[PDB]
Chains A and B, each alone.
Chain A
Amino acid sequence: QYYGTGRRKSSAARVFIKPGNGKIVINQRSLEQYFGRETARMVVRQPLELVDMVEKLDLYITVKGGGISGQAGAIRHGITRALMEYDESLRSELRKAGFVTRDARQVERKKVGLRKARRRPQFSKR
């Protein structure tokens, strides 16, 4: 068995990789069940495709906090890093995609003086 923390935005998804059929369990619920009708759901298992696993691995996931979208990215990271433990050599190929990198973007307070907290209000054709 192997483990992966995985984090994105405001969500944590522990990934416990285990050799098996290829079914994953998200909070005691099937992958499709939890992520029901959310095209993005697919990206969650992307890291497993690169190194070609899934049909060889069975995963047990535990996610909490944030939203389904964020959880999807969190579980992804957890899977990528978990794959590393199984075989470090996977890094050389799994890293090129950037799956080992955690998206640091965080919904920052929409500061004022600007409309986007970052983006400032320009001026008319002076």
Chain B
Amino acid sequence: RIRIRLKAFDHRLIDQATAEIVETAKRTGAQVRGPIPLPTRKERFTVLISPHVNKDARDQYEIRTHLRLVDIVEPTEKTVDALMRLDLAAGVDVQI
């Protein structure tokens, strides 16, 4: 019963890592509760597009912090061995 929340800024690097975390644990251990999205806290900025005049412009910007659950139950010795060894994603912060 090990829950793994995977968070990051880039949406893709997460799907890659999260998917790997699952696929690898799909063999040695349980099928995992399956990778999920969860609520993503968004941070947006609204600054002027053009440096002058056109006051009526200032576009919208956003930096999202995506999350994941995965959650792997019924962990076996090899279930963890497949985790500790392989770790690619760098923009992904793991929390087991």
Contact = CB atoms under 8 A, between A and B. Distances in A.
Interface stretch (B9-17, B53-61, B62-70, B78-86): B53-61
Contacts, number: 7
Contacts of A114: 56
A114 B55 CA distance: 11
Interface in A89-126: 112-114
A113 B48 CA distance: 12
Contacts of B55: 112
Interface residues of A, number: 3
Interface in A63-113: 112-113
Nearest to B55: A112
Nearest to A109: B60
Nearest to A112: B56
Interface in B26-64: 55-58
Nearest to B57: A112
Nearest to B58: A112
Nearest to A115: B56
A36 B55 CA distance: 42
Contacts of B58: 112
Nearest to A114: B56
A48 B70 CA distance: 48
Contacts of A112: 55-58
A113 B59 CA distance: 12
A112 B55 CA distance: 8
A92 to B, nearest CB: 42
Interface of B: 55-58
5 contacts: A112-B55, A112-B56, A112-B57, A112-B58, A113-B57
Top 7 A-B residue pairs of the complex, sorted by shortest distance between their CB atoms: A112-B56, A113-B56, A112-B57, A112-B58, A112-B55, A113-B57, A114-B56
